[PDB]
Design a protein around this ligand. Structure first.
Ligand SMILES: Nc1nc2c(ncn2[C@@H]2O[C@H](COP(=O)(O)OP(=O)(O)CP(=O)(O)O)[C@@H](O)[C@H]2O)c(=O)[nH]1
Lengths: 136, 37, 132, 313, 126, 23, 95
RNA sequence: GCCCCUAAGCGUGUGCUAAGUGGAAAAGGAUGUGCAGUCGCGAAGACAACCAGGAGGUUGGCUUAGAAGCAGCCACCCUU
């Protein structure tokens, strides 16, 4: 899926899910973007699901721009274990999305088809979203 | 009858109505007769 | 009642007529041989007829001529129409002769305008998809 | 979803005997290795759990999977009822994997199923309509794929395949012609056929034989030696060479349950002419004075329909 | 009507109204295309019968500058506005009310300067 | 989970000002 | 041309700016080679109208106190969530 | 907190809600309703409704036993 080739520190603290986004709050690569209206840890599998849905709806034309990258590692203590004895091994890759940040952008010649593709991708994401357009 | 929390038109001749405090898709085709929970 | 365009073929045609006339009631032999008597003067293209049945034995014959939509097809040597209408044009016909010989088919067209009825005929030809 | 449960059940049933030692060994080794598997997820998921480790957890998931597979059989019977009720003549394509089993079904009919070069990829049976070149329609089914010494935990994952095999008329084992020892595949496929016809007692169906990839073959027999099984048709799915001969002989070898009759129809009842012309596969006729000398392999619904309007000529 | 497109046809019909010689405000109800086209080809270019929107044509005949027959635009008015003739080109036009039973002529006003409930059975007929 | 859900919604009250002990 | 009407700001800061935005008045600053920062509160929705009608590279009339001054927008400030105009930078233009 | 239990308002002035909402809940679904916009049509009569026409070349052609507006294809025209 999506993974960072190398990470300096494999076990990190939880990304801070606070405040609205300060950068990336605009369509800069395409024509239609999927802004985010809630805080979420969006994992690499969710990103691949959304990307595949977008790339299969239009299925021929236009590019898909995935702004966020799942580089933050989320750990997971092994099952049926008691609390203690160290932090668990990394299990999930998340992107600390924030409200206002545009997660996906797209450029397809047919407007309504692009809108419907973005709608069909919003359903794969754990948060609210809306269709934002380069033409402000 | 399709009791689903999401009820949508399925064909060109499906109408969504509010009957007895419930959303129903009434269509000539009985296969599209969907009623929201 | 039926504006069936009976084929010009004067050699054994009822089966084609027999269905369309056995779904109603008219003498098959009388109808066939009267149309065949008309074809004795009409051997070009099978001219159309509107058999006007009222309750039995209509005995009515009026001429509307056969491939008007393709009178141009018939009078060029080119057949099979065009199975790619406007994808690419198929065949070659003359643009002056359509305007000229539109006279015969103007007898049942809409308006008496000469160039515009020629455009009618050009439309029926370009329906195939051809150059004319 | 069905496969992601059958595969997981097969892996659990294979790993349950070998829990201690080996099982803990891949419990220690968690990197996504070849044994790392993944279950039906494939993209890990329970792949980080591989085949799980705990016998208690394995037992619980096994019970749930048994119940779920039970459900997805009374689903499949429903989905196949329409074919069963209509009794459309079914033809299935079996054989060793990578023997052009899906290319044939994309070749005779323009199905368009995945034709990847790797090993078992068409792991879920799919069926498609088809018309015998001359007459009747049919249905065509391509199966999963057979291997020498097939695993004994995968019979459930093959159960739907077996069902399609039993419910068939013309069985087709497709042999990869351009491959060493083109008979080793055949013996294993045949043996699978016998165990199927034994487990579900039924009259064995005729087995149509086709040699595939003979376009690239160097003629391993190049003779009646290449006729290692003399009854076979040498198709080339990559080029579509024996399609005509295959499409002809497969129908001729399916048997016809039609009813060929000669009937005449006065023109008033053109409904019958249309019904014979759209359901019955008329050979030909001459367009008679009042009717037609139709010689149609009419079916059972219309067999008694056309009895009244018969003819003797 | 069509705010922009209306005035074009209003002006066209108006100029043909003032250019013509008379008027027969008639009933076109029940005119199947066959008989209507037979009429269009019978009177020909003269009295070139072509229905126009009655609400607009009230202002169109006034655009030509004349009033009158505008009074009786109740119902589906049909207009001919005969080009050259008066008597010989109106015989069949009025008598189509006898032959086809259609085109009962309410009429009411001739040329925009002469009112007559006998708009057809006048000189136009005799 | 009814009991805990009620005991937690109990804090959302005018007199408690949205915070209860053991919420 | 664009005919916008502008008013100066008597109170500046966070609280005054939010209060101005609460009454549909986008705050703005007038600066440039005029070498004098003018703190203005521009009535809203008409700023938006002209920005949608012509674009950022336009010429605002900005009748401040009965005195006309031509300017051009240089820097905006939209809220990422509630897309509006939080603050606009106007560059002085002398003819 | 102020209708009775239960001390004090069945307070006054503007609106909203029909769900007993008030008096638990999500993704999502939705002709619920109010308010403030904007855009399109329209007294030259719009929208709904009723009365008429709704034509001809023509059955456009290919296609097929057959497809004639209405298997399905291309075009998707000409005239009144
Ligand atoms: N050169 C050549 N290649 C062929 C021929 N028939 C099939 N193949 C190849 O066999 C490969 C395997 O594809 P597929 O058709 O799925 O074979 P298969 O037996 O169905 C493999 P599976 O059983 O998993 O579906 C394909 O890449 C195809 O190119 C043939 O006649 N000639």
């Amino acid at each position: 899926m999506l993974i960072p080739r190398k990470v300096k520190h494999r076990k990190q603290h939880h990304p801070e899910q606070r405040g609205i986004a300060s950068g990336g709050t605009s369509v800069s690569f395409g024509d239609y973007g999927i802004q985010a209206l809630e805080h979420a840890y969006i994992t690499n599998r969710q990103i691949e699901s959304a990307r595949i849905a977008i790339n299969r709806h239009i299925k021929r034309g236009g590019k898909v721009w995935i702004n966020i990258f799942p580089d933050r590692p989320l750990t997971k203590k092994p099952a049926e274990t008691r609390m203690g004895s160290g932090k668990g091994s990394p299990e999930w890759w998340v992107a600390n999305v924030k409200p206002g940040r545009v997660l996906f952008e797209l450029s397809y010649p047919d407007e309504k088809t692009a809108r419907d593709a973005l709608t069909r991708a919003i359903h794969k994401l754990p948060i609210k979203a809306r269709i934002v357009t380069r033409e402000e | 009858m399709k009791v689903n929390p999401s009820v949508k038109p399925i064909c060109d001749k499906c109408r969504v109505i509010r009957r007895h405090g419930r959303v129903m898709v009434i269509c000539s085709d009985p296969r599209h007769k969907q009623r929201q929970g | 009642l039926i504006k069936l365009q009976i084929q010009a073929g004067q050699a054994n045609p009822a089966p084609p007529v027999g269905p369309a006339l056995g779904q109603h009631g008219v003498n098959i032999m009388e109808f066939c041989k009267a149309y065949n008597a008309a074809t004795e003067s009409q051997r070009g293209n099978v001219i159309p007829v509107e058999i006007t049945v009222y309750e039995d034995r209509s005995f009515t014959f009026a001429l509307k001529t056969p491939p008007a939509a393709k009178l141009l097809l018939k009078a060029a040597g080119v057949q099979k129409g065009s199975g790619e209408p406007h994808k690419t044009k198929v065949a070659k016909v003359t643009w002056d002769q359509v305007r000229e010989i539109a006279e015969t088919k103007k007898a049942d067209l809409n308006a008496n305008d000469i160039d515009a009825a020629a455009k009618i005929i050009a439309g029926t030809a370009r329906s195939m998809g051809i150059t004319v | 979803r069905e496969g992601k449960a059958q595969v997981s059940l097969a892996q659990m049933e294979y790993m349950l005997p070998r829990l201690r030692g080996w099982g803990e060994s891949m419990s220690r080794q968690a990197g996504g290795r070849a044994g790392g598997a993944g279950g039906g997820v494939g993209t890990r998921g329970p792949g980080e759990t591989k085949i799980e480790t705990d016998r208690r957890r394995i037992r619980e998931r096994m019970a749930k999977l048994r119940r779920e597979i039970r459900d997805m059989k009374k689903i499949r019977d429903t989905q196949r009822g329409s074919r069963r009720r209509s009794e459309i003549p079914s033809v299935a394509i079996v054989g060793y994997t990578n023997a052009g089993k899906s290319s044939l079904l994309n070749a005779l009919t323009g199905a368009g199923v995945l034709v990847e070069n790797a090993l078992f990829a068409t792991l879920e049976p799919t069926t498609r309509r088809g018309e015998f070149e001359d007459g009747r329609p049919f249905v065509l089914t391509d199966t999963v794929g057979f291997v020498r010494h097939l695993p004994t935990q995968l019979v459930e994952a093959f159960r739907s395949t077996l069902e399609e095999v039993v419910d068939a008329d013309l069985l087709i084992h497709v042999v990869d012609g351009s491959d060493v020892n083109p008979l080793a595949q055949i013996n294993a496929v045949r043996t699978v056929i016998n165990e199927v016809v034994a487990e579900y007692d039924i009259a064995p169906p005729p087995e149509l034989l086709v040699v595939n990839k003979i376009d690239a073959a160097t003629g391993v027999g190049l003779a009646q030696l290449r006729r290692a099984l003399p009854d076979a048709v040498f198709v080339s799915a990559r080029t579509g060479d024996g399609l005509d001969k295959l499409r002809s002989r497969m129908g001729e070898l399916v048997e016809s349950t039609d009813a060929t009759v000669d009937v005449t129809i006065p023109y008033d009842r053109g409904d019958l002419v249309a019904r014979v012309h759209t359901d019955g596969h008329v050979d030909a006729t001459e367009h008679t004075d009042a009717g037609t000398r139709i010689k149609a392999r009419v079916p059972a619904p219309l067999a008694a329909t056309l009895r009244e309007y018969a003819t003797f000529a | 009507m069509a705010k922009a497109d209306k005035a074009t046809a209003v002006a066209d019909i108006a100029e043909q109204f003032k250019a013509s010689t008379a008027t027969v405000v008639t009933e076109y109800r029940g005119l199947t295309v066959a008989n209507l086209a037979e009429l269009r080809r019978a009177l020909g270019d003269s009295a070139t019968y072509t229905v126009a929107k009655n609400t607009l044509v009230k202002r169109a005949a006034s655009e030509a500058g004349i009033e009158g027959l505008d009074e009786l635009f109740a119902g589906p008015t049909a207009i001919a506005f005969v080009k050259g003739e008066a008597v010989d080109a109106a015989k069949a036009i009025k008598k189509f009310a006898k032959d086809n039973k259609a085109l009962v002529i309410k009429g009411g006003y001739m040329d925009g300067k002469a009112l007559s409930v006998a708009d057809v059975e006048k000189i136009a007929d005799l | 989970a009814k009991r805990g859900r009620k005991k937690r919604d109990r804090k959302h009250s005018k007199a408690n000002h949205g915070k209860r002990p053991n919420a | 041309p664009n005919k916008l009407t502008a008013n100066v700001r008597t109170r500046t800061g966070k609280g005054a700016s939010r209060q101005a935005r609460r009454d549909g008045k986008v705050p703005a600053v007038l600066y440039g080679h005029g070498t004098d920062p003018q703190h203005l509160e521009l009535n809203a929705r008409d700023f938006a109208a002209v920005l949608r009608s012509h674009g950022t590279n336009a010429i605002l009339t900005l009748d401040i106190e009965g005195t006309e001054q031509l300017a051009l927008t240089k820097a905006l400030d939209v809220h990422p969530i509630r897309r509006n105009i939080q603050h606009a930078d106007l560059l002085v233009v002398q003819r």
